[PDB]
Write an enzyme that holds these catalytic residues in place. Structure first.
Site, short mmCIF file in Angstrom:
data_model
loop_
_atom_site.label_atom_id
_atom_site.label_comp_id
_atom_site.label_asym_id
_atom_site.label_seq_id
_atom_site.Cartn_x
_atom_site.Cartn_y
_atom_site.Cartn_z
CB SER A 269 30.81 51.73 43.77
OG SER A 269 29.38 51.54 43.83
C1 LIG Z 1 28.61 52.62 43.63
O1 LIG Z 1 28.69 53.62 44.31
C2 LIG Z 1 27.65 52.42 42.49
C3 LIG Z 1 28.30 52.17 41.17
C4 LIG Z 1 27.40 51.39 40.23
C5 LIG Z 1 26.07 52.04 39.96
C6 LIG Z 1 25.55 51.83 38.56
C7 LIG Z 1 26.63 51.65 37.52
C8 LIG Z 1 26.22 52.07 36.14
C9 LIG Z 1 26.04 53.56 35.98
C10 LIG Z 1 24.61 53.97 35.72
#
Ligand SMILES: *C(=O)CCCCCCCCC
Ligand SMILES: *C(=O)CCCCCCCCC
Lengths: 169, 575, 574, 169
Positions: free
Chosen positions: C1
């Site tokens: 992400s």
């Molecule tokens: C990336 O590493 C993942 C980011 C998104 C995961 C879920 C986002 C909401 C948090 C529970």
């Protein structure tokens, strides 16, 4: 002194091996089998020798499905080394007539011959011809595969379980 | 795997006919490879061998022909060890401590980072065989301070297999073939059928290496744990390894210690036919059932036969009765070549109408409280002729349906040893709801797949060669197919592709006869000889199989040299 | 992400700019769903939620904009239990026997024959958490007549997560957003970056629920077994369940027993930028590293950054330095929309030329005793501009190459905390043979895929809608991509298909800014809203993503009703 | 109880829910989610309730990849029933603001609404609409899914391990 075999191929590439003795028959047979299925066979001998993990990693599964199923390489390697031991090979080879011993030695030599051809060049077997695990084998390597074929109704089905049979810590 | 062995009474010819039809792997080292071996003054044999094996395992010579099928006979067993207090690596036999044979094994293993590290484990053998971890099976079976478990495979000490096939490769009569099979008794885990030149009777046998246990041992040696696995692994001896009286027996005519004597292993000769479709020796011939042999070989009048077994034997009876739609009433090479590719589906032939009669009116259902329109599904199935050919439409719908039908209390007419081919039968009216559930699901799955309900099977069932989809035929034996083309690919994932690693399916196929002129053989190697996609022999055989064009394989030197694609080359090197 | 938080110094405007880029699932219940909630007098929020969650986890309102990325911080721990001799369902705590809390559970399970049979198992809890079987980890950690094992996840007693997202949805300022985060401290396992309307600085924080253990505890309470795998689970407390002193501590400003106080959890505010690509808090901003915080949050200068982390920061620095080939030197909405879909590959940009210079002279090789012709591979990769766009040729060859390059002593210049974006570097000439081995395999794989070495990436990387293959761009982080399109499918099985269940990839994407007129958001939902193939919203969003055409999502009532595809309908029930 | 929600969809089918309160907001939100992703969602509630095995078999894997990975149904069922117990749900709910509890009540009601429409007929969700696991849910079922999302950083990673943690034989 020498292996010699005439290889006739007909429709669909069906090979007809003609040889003067059993050793040469194995030579021709080993050649044509490798010529057509080098990658599969090369991979196979990794299995019986228990040398999968060193090349392909321990946690990866068998590439090909077989009488052995598709366990993890590491468990497969242990199974083969434990059950298809040097001793088992000794007892197998000791019970054979001379013609079959000769035939298997010819088989290995014939298989090894093509390995040399594939390494040298050609557009055949592009998928594996330059991999480290495409290599010469021994008669005992073939005998290992023969022994392995016998175990389909028994040990083969308990490969992982045999590889992980450990006493309490 | 299927095999037929027809005698002269079924052939109407001077010799019998042999149909070999192993359902095996399409990829991997165990796949068959077709070849002929001509060894001056020794052997002239043609057929098929596992990649890595130097002798023909299934094939023919000038005098005999044979095939194999996996046998229901158990080839292994378990021994429960009573461990010495203080040493979990020693076990007790009649009060005497015995040390387990250890082996410290080091396996080099490549890591994801390209490095190679060593993994070391110490593994043990008992006098019965390797220790085995049954924890996953049931955590109560864990290797503890009190008890451990070993597995014994009778073939671990069997070194007569290659020698058996080699001598068969050389055999000059069926009588020799049979004699060899009895001398060696080395077949590891398969039945055998064989036909010979100038012999009127075909040969079946489950003669090989099989654990030898007495009914007494089965009653007084089976341990508490063992009695719990009598359901999962029936007829698998699960004995107490603390008592020598529970060791496997040797008969006077045993070739190997712990194995059954030749004379207590089933066989049969018949002028009409012998056959096996992977069930027990029982129905080698439906007219002459075999009985009274050790239970480790499987049931013989107690258990229902598979749909494929029922289909197999039915096909033979209808052939010899001349009611199968094929010319005459004899098992001729030409007729057999066709019948075996008939793609008849037992499940449909026998049960479809009953199913449609029970659920297809009304055709508008309520399933799980949801409205389901099943009018099209019913119409397609009603118009289907219960065959899995390339042009058959709806056969895939039946597949997705039948595989989801609950088998519990599905039939109202129970199995009868008197009528093994037509029992069990009678679709239970009480199963109405479950059937609509299965049919609703089946329609949905076909929907996900992008295929119409009435799509021809050849578009759903296929194999790719040269970038084009070759249409295929047949199906999985669980639905009562005889012609087996069984994909492991879910229909929703691009149909029944055979390009991956399919389930046991038609591989090497041979129809061998012995006319006056000499052995004649027609063959298929469905997936072709080469695993190399660039090879000219990667898809040539496959294309013919798709087109149902058997190959008359050359055998004599004149046939080989006269072949249209004849090429020869000599390979030599120092030994 | 990935996520960026740009301040006014970087935007050159009155408000900051937020880039949310979660790499998440393309199928399953955890996949994101885009929507807007307008609740009279309480909230007007727009963004994304897991299927099954009723509040917005990632998005924006009229005042704030935020996103998340998985944190390096460990959120769980192990407790080695000393059992009571005779009864292995009881453990000793400071001497006094404690009973395990049992629960016999019967699960109905459908058999293969179609019948339903019951399977019953008796499982246990401790005061720390559920009993866990670590035998698969190491046969020596089996539940014995002396020792057992339990696992504790701090989020197990955390009942504040939704309430936090709910309050954020309603927040009116970045300051309130921050206050909420500190007040609730309920974020479970992700980092947080937030931007605000009229606020000068962007906000980063790894402020959530995190196990609290003292350095003294690490030394005293770590068990023999614990030591033996602190390299498999770095920074995961593997403590003794016999001593109460080995139980997680509670600070004065701790919101939850056993969790870290809000004072000793990392955060930073910047007028330039904040960012995270799944590495530790350390480099929230590269110009101002964060250090000093507890170890359980991850390394802060002792570990090398991933290739993607280095790619992300590098892109921001080159943007603001105005040397990335885009207009100006400011992080504007239009430029960020392109920069983030750049398809730059860090491995290629930095190491490719070095590898070819080492191994491609000559290009006819001998590998594993075998003659190998690598001439075309060398030519394709030299012509390739180190980008994974649809028109890029040879990117897939690099992928198949780099993923097989042994990393052990591959670099001559090792990691330097003082230069973490440009270290490690220096392809060791000693690895030439190893590089050739890897490259030979890569060519062999591509050959078996039916794709040419110079195949455009758009044909190898794709997604199928309505029988048509939509060309895609991007790649996997391991290779140093920022724009993530990571297939789980092996190239030999029909290329880099994204129709299966791919690895974490570009899912919901948002570029949010706060102009005077009001919030403006551009978004993507890569796989589209609907999992039903017969739906008009199954591949409409996907086509756009393929063509790289961002959607300006309506927010204001006037924008919603003025949309070219406006449809309204109301639903009621007693 | 008396939920009312206006659903505006714009380009790409993006819904914009308008409601006068949180309960009605959840109603609209739950409805549109189910309207677009019924099959996935219906499957997911099997998971969190530990009812996968009943319908799909115990040996089969999870259909979809998630924070939970893809263990065997049987193990997942035990995990969820054990870790996400009624007590776990009770305490999660006990610590919620009135408006959230209301929003979840609504969300369940909105989901159930579409379920009835799907069962009634239509060609939407043809792949699952007639299956038994497509069924109404409770507010608690949604709270199970909410709680399950928190464990992604911990328990979820040891689902199988937790479900097979049994005292020594
Ligand atoms: C990336 O590493 C993942 C980011 C998104 C995961 C879920 C986002 C909401 C948090 C529970
Ligand atoms: C069907 O079950 C085919 C039989 C298995 C292979 C036969 C080859 C001989 C090996 C014992």
């Amino acid at each position: 002194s020498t292996y010699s075999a005439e290889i006739r191929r007909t429709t669909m590439g069906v090979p007809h091996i003609k040889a003067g003795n059993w050793g040469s028959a194995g030579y021709g047979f080993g050649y044509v089998q490798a010529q057509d299925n080098l990658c599969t066979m090369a991979d196979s001998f990794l299995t019986y020798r228990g040398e999968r993990s060193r090349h392909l990693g321990g946690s990866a599964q068998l590439v090909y499905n077989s009488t052995l199923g598709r366990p993890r390489n590491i468990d497969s390697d242990f199974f083969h080394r434990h059950v298809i031991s040097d001793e088992a090979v000794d007892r197998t080879m000791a019970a054979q007539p001379a013609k079959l011993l000769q035939m298997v030695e010819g088989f290995a030599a014939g298989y090894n011959r093509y390995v040399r051809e594939a390494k040298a060049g050609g557009s055949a077997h592009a998928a594996c011809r330059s991999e480290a695990w495409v290599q010469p084998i021994t008669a005992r390597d073939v005998w290992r595969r023969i022994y392995a074929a016998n175990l389909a109704g028994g040990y083969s089905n308990f490969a992982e379980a045999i590889a992980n049979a450990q006493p309490p810590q | 795997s299927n095999m037929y062995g027809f005698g002269t009474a079924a052939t109407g010819e001077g010799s019998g006919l042999l149909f070999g039809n192993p359902h095996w792997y399409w990829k991997g080292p165990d796949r068959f490879y077709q070849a002929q071996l001509t060894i001056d003054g020794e052997a002239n044999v043609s057929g098929v061998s596992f990649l890595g094996l130097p002798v023909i395992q299934i094939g023919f010579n000038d005098s005999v022909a044979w095939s194999h099928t996996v046998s229901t006979a158990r080839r292994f067993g378990f021994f429960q060890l009573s461990l010495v207090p203080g040493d979990p690596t020693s076990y007790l036999v009649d009060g005497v401590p015995v040390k387990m044979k250890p082996a410290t094994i080091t396996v080099p293993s490549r890591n994801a980072d390209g490095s190679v590290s060593d993994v070391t484990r110490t593994l043990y053998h008992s006098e019965f065989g390797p220790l085995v971890n049954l924890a996953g099976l049931n955590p109560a079976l864990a290797w503890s301070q009190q008890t451990a478990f070993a597995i014994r495979d009778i073939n671990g000490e069997n070194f007569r297999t290659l020698r058996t096939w080699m001598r068969w490769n050389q055999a000059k009569s069926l009588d020799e073939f049979i004699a060899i099979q009895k001398e060696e008794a080395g077949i590891p885990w398969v039945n055998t059928v064989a036909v010979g030149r100038g012999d009127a009777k075909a040969w079946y046998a489950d003669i090989g290496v099989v654990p030898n246990v007495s009914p007494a041992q089965l009653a007084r040696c089976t341990t508490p744990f063992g009695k719990a696995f009598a359901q999962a692994l029936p007829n698998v001896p699960f004995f107490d390894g603390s008592r020598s009286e529970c060791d496997w027996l040797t008969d006077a005519d045993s070739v190997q210690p712990g194995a059954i004597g030749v004379s207590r292993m089933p066989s049969l000769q018949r002028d009409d036919y012998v056959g096996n479709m992977n069930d027990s020796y029982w129905l080698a011939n439906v007219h002459a059932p075999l009985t009274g042999y050790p239970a480790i070989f499987g049931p013989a009048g107690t258990s229902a036969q598979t749909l494929r077994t029922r289909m197999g034997h039915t096909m033979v009876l209808e052939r010899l009765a001349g009611t199968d739609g094929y010319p005459g009433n004899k098992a001729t090479p030409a007729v057999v070549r066709e019948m075996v590719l008939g793609n008849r589906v037992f499940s449909a032939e026998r049960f479809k109408d009953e199913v449609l009669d029970l659920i297809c009116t009304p055709a508008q259902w309520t399933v799980n409280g949801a409205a389901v329109d099943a009018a099209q599904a019913c119409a397609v199935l009603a118009a289907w002729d219960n065959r899995g050919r390339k042009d058959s439409r709806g056969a895939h719908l039946w597949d997705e349906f039948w595989s989801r039908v609950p088998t519990a209390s599905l039939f109202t007419v129970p199995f009868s040893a008197a009528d093994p081919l037509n029992t069990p039968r009678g679709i239970n009216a009480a199963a109405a709801d479950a059937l609509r559930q299965a049919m609703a699901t089946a329609v949905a799955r076909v929907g996900q797949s992008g295929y119409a309900l009435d799509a021809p099977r050849g578009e759903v069932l296929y194999v790719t060669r040269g970038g084009t989809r070759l249409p295929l035929y047949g199906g999985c034996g669980a639905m009562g197919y005889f012609t087996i083309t069984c994909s492991e690919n879910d229909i929703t994932q691009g149909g029944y592709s055979m390009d991956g690693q399919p389930n046991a399916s038609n591989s090497y196929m041979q129809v061998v006869s012995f006319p006056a002129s000499g052995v004649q053989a027609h063959t298929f190697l469905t997936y072709s000889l080469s695993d190399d996609p660039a090879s000219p022999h990667h898809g040539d055989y496959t294309k013919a199989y798709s087109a149902g064009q058997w190959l008359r394989v050359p055998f004599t030197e004149a046939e080989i040299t006269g072949n249209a694609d004849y090429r020869t080359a000599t390979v030599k090197e120092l030994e």
